[PDB]
Amino acid sequence: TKQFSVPNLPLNVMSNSRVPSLLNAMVVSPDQAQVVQFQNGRCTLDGQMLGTTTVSASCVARFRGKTFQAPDNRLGINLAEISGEPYHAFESPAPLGFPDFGDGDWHVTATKVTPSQLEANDPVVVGNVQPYNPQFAPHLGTLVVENPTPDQVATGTDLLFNITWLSNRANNRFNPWVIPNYGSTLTEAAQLAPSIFPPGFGETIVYFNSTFPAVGATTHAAIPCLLPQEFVAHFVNEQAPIRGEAALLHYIDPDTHRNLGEFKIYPEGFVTCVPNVGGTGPQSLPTNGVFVFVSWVSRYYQLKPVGTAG
Amino acid sequence: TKQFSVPNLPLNVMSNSRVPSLLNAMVVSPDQAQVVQFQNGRCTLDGQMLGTTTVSASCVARFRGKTFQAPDNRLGINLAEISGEPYHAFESPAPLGFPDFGDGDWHVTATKVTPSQLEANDPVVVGNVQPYNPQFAPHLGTLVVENPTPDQVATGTDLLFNITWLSNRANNRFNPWVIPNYGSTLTEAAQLAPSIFPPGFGETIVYFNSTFPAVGATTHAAIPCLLPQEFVAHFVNEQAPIRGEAALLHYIDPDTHRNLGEFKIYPEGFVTCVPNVGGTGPQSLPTNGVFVFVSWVSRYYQLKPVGTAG
Numbered sequence: 001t002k003q004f005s006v007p008n009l010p011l012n013v014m015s016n017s018r019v020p021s022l023l024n025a026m027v028v029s030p031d032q033a034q035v036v037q038f039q040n041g042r043c044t045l046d047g048q049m050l051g052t053t054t055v056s057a058s059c060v061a062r063f064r065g066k067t068f069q070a071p072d073n074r075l076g077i078n079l080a081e082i083s084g085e086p087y088h089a090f091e092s093p094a095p096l097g098f099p100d101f102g103d104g105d106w107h108v109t110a111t112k113v114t115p116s117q118l119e120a121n122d123p124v125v126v127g128n129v130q131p132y133n134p135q136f137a138p139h140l141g142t143l144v145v146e147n148p149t150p151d152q153v154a155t156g157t158d159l160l161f162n163i164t165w166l167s168n169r170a171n172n173r174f175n176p177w178v179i180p181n182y183g184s185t186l187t188e189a190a191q192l193a194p195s196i197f198p199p200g201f202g203e204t205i206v207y208f209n210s211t212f213p214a215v216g217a218t219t220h221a222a223i224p225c226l227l228p229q230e231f232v233a234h235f236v237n238e239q240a241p242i243r244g245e246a247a248l249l250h251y252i253d254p255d256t257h258r259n260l261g262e263f264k265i266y267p268e269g270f271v272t273c274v275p276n277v278g279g280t281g282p283q284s285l286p287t288n289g290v291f292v293f294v295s296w297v298s299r300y301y302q303l304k305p306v307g308t309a310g
Numbered sequence: 311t312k313q314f315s316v317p318n319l320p321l322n323v324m325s326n327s328r329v330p331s332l333l334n335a336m337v338v339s340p341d342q343a344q345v346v347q348f349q350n351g352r353c354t355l356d357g358q359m360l361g362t363t364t365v366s367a368s369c370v371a372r373f374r375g376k377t378f379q380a381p382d383n384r385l386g387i388n389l390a391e392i393s394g395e396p397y398h399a400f401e402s403p404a405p406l407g408f409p410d411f412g413d414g415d416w417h418v419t420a421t422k423v424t425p426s427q428l429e430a431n432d433p434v435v436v437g438n439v440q441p442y443n444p445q446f447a448p449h450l451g452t453l454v455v456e457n458p459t460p461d462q463v464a465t466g467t468d469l470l471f472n473i474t475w476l477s478n479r480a481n482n483r484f485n486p487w488v489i490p491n492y493g494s495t496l497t498e499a500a501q502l503a504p505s506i507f508p509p510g511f512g513e514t515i516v517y518f519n520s521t522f523p524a525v526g527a528t529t530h531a532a533i534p535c536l537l538p539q540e541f542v543a544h545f546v547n548e549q550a551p552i553r554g555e556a557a558l559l560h561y562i563d564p565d566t567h568r569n570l571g572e573f574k575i576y577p578e579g580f581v582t583c584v585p586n587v588g589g590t591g592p593q594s595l596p597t598n599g600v601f602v603f604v605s606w607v608s609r610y611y612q613l614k615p616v617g618t619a620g
């Protein structure tokens with residue numbers, strides 16, 4: 001009897017589910033060549049999170065661990081959950097919220113989080129994580145911080161990391177669609193969230209974009225995700241059973257109260273639209289509108305085209 | 311017709327409303343000597359945010375602005391909203407999400423956010439904000455970053471700031487209850503969220519704590535808030551009319567499904583309990599329980615004592 005719904009927050013007050021940033025756009029990208037397989041911001045409509053998705057906004061693209069000394073003044077990190085609870089292999093692709101950008105450098109700022117170590121002095125460690133490096137093994141709970149400052153940190157120091165910015169590899173652009181290689185062999189329990197394949201009926205996947213310090217990106221400083229973090233939190237909170245093959249949403253103007261565009265959101269946890277031919281689809285719509293659940297529909301419900309013709 | 315409710319997320323997956331951190335405790339402190347007047351994490355039960363409270367998790371304790379040169383190689387900042395929209399004086403105490411810690415230094419990490427300035431190079435600016443400094447004027451839209459690195463940033467650079475850590479002033483401890491002096495004279499529209507006074511009936515205010523890099527604090531690295539950010543977002547989303555003088559909550563074990571403790575949440579947006587005499591009140595309860603709305607009650611409903619006797 002719990003009926004389905006989406007948060008009725010304006011798009012531009014909701015946040016990305018792959019970096020901790022405001023959403024400021026939605027886009028389509030039909031003719032781009034990458035698999036769609038983000039591990040963060042993945043949640044079914046009845047509230048089952050997939051991949052490494054956490055419900056917690058403050059865990060999105062964070063990681064935590066304890067220091068040990070690796071060769072050549074590199075800083076090894078034994079991962080834990082951001083909560084401090086232990087992380088064990090063979091159960092998920094990586095700890096909850098663990099960043100899912102594999103195509104470039106993570107410039108990280110960390111702080112000590114042990115209260116006894118926070119009575120005095122600078123608690124910051126900065127450095128650079130290279131997910132394409134051969135010592136990147138997040139599924140088994142270990143990674144390396146290159147070029148740390150301070151360059152010597154006592155073994156066993158508990159550190160909470162944020163990604164201050166992302167950057168391209170040398171002579172490439174940073175593609176924010178590329179997920180990391182989590183390493184190992186994932187058990188069936190620890191499987192990646194599946195890849196999303198393009199839906200039929202002239203539909204294309206809608207991405208919720210944030211401006212983010214992703215330097216040298218293929219997108220010009222924009223990080224895409226499939227669901228606002230508030231959508232993830234809403235579905236986990238609600239646990240509304242799936243009662244149709246897709247959910248029709250209207251994107252409503254808050255001023256005029258009128259329908260700006262039709263969208264479908266699929267049980268697997270992704271949004272589509274039909275772009276008006278020869279235009280940017282939903283990208284030209286105002287960003288202060290609100291998504292509203294209309295009804296369940298079947299997969300073959302035909303959406304009215306959204307956006308302008310160019 | 312819209313009935314009241316609280317998010318049914320476990321305490322330890324929700325987040326602070328004054329810093330972007332997981333909640334990991336709830337405490338009482340009936341005897342601490344400060345006024346209770348946070349400006350973030352303030353929301354009525356029918357969903358009106360107060361002070362500088364934003365609904366957006368990724369705006370909590372952030373600020374944004376454009377650089378100008380101040381005397382003695384200080385970095386002046388003309389504030390904007392985190393969304394980039396202009397901030398005008400005389401309407402709120404400070405921009406939405408603006409940090410509300412007045413008793414110590416804010417060690418900040420900023421990045422450029424203009425996409426054209428993110429095609430290449432290091433976008434980071436770090437420095438220190440001193441809210442007790444005479445050039446701290448957030449209501450009128452301006453503040454100063456002391457000791458910036460780089461020490462010269464082009465005028466007009468758009469910067470998004472996070473607080474990496476907080477620290478005590480010299481020869482003092484950092485009290486996280488103290489809010490900034492926002493300056494000026496606040497118009498009636500721009501008024502601070504009111505102070506909360508101790509309730510009757512043996513009740514005391516419940517604080518939701520996070521471990522946070524607050525160095526040299528009176529709390530030993532713990533930041534208190536009145537409401538989890540998810541509660542704020544829930545009330546704004548729901549807009550459930552107030553239908554009683556207080557809302558009785560139970561804090562339910564997710565395993566045994568039994569009631570761990572009775573709490574009241576008041577229309578003004580704060581939680582209370584009655585601590586069992588001579589103990590820490592709710593602090594000893596497991597942090598993985600879930601708050602559930604029982605009913606509206608009057609102010610004189612008498613809560614069963616929570617916690618152990620010591």
Ligand SMILES: CC(=O)N[C@@H]1[C@@H](O[C@@H]2O[C@@H](C)[C@@H](O)[C@@H](O)[C@@H]2O)[C@H](O[C@@H]2O[C@H](CO)[C@H](O)[C@H](O)[C@H]2O)[C@@H](CO)O[C@@H]1O
Pocket residue numbers: 119120121122415438477478479480481525526
């Ligand atoms: C041992 C010593 O004096 N070290 C100082 C730093 O002071 C210590 O660390 C800070 C974080 C604070 O806890 C102080 O009480 C400690 O004694 C000093 O840090 C500055 O300290 C002032 C207050 O004394 C403010 O908190 C600043 O924000 C801190 O940066 C640094 C830099 O001056 O110098 C020595 O390491």
Ligand SMILES: CC(=O)N[C@@H]1[C@@H](O[C@@H]2O[C@@H](C)[C@@H](O)[C@@H](O)[C@@H]2O)[C@H](O[C@@H]2O[C@H](CO)[C@H](O)[C@H](O)[C@H]2O)[C@@H](CO)O[C@@H]1O
Pocket residue numbers: 105128167168169170171215216429430431432
């Ligand atoms: C003009 C120049 O060569 N500057 C380099 C930096 O490279 C530029 O900035 C980075 C962020 C990237 O956009 C490069 O494509 C630019 O040319 C260099 O930064 C490192 O660059 C590598 C890739 O070249 C990675 O992105 C690293 O993560 C960056 O730190 C710095 C440090 O090596 O040196 C000069 O400033």
Ligand SMILES: [Cl-]
Pocket residue numbers: 001
């Ligand atoms: Cl039904």
Ligand SMILES: [Cl-]
Pocket residue numbers: 004005006007008291292293
């Ligand atoms: Cl809805």
Ligand SMILES: [Cl-]
Pocket residue numbers: 053054055056096323
């Ligand atoms: Cl979670």
Ligand SMILES: [Cl-]
Pocket residue numbers: 114115116117
């Ligand atoms: Cl400790």
Ligand SMILES: [Cl-]
Pocket residue numbers: 180181182183
């Ligand atoms: Cl993998």
Ligand SMILES: [Cl-]
Pocket residue numbers: 280283284
């Ligand atoms: Cl457009």
Ligand SMILES: [Cl-]
Pocket residue numbers: 297298299300301
């Ligand atoms: Cl249909």
Ligand SMILES: [Cl-]
Pocket residue numbers: 311
């Ligand atoms: Cl009624």
Ligand SMILES: [Cl-]
Pocket residue numbers: 311312313314
């Ligand atoms: Cl209802």
Ligand SMILES: [Cl-]
Pocket residue numbers: 311312550551
């Ligand atoms: Cl109503």
Ligand SMILES: [Cl-]
Pocket residue numbers: 314315316317318601602603
């Ligand atoms: Cl409830």
Ligand SMILES: [Cl-]
Pocket residue numbers: 013363364365366406
């Ligand atoms: Cl807001």
Ligand SMILES: [Cl-]
Pocket residue numbers: 424425426427
């Ligand atoms: Cl630009």
Ligand SMILES: [Cl-]
Pocket residue numbers: 553554555
């Ligand atoms: Cl009443």
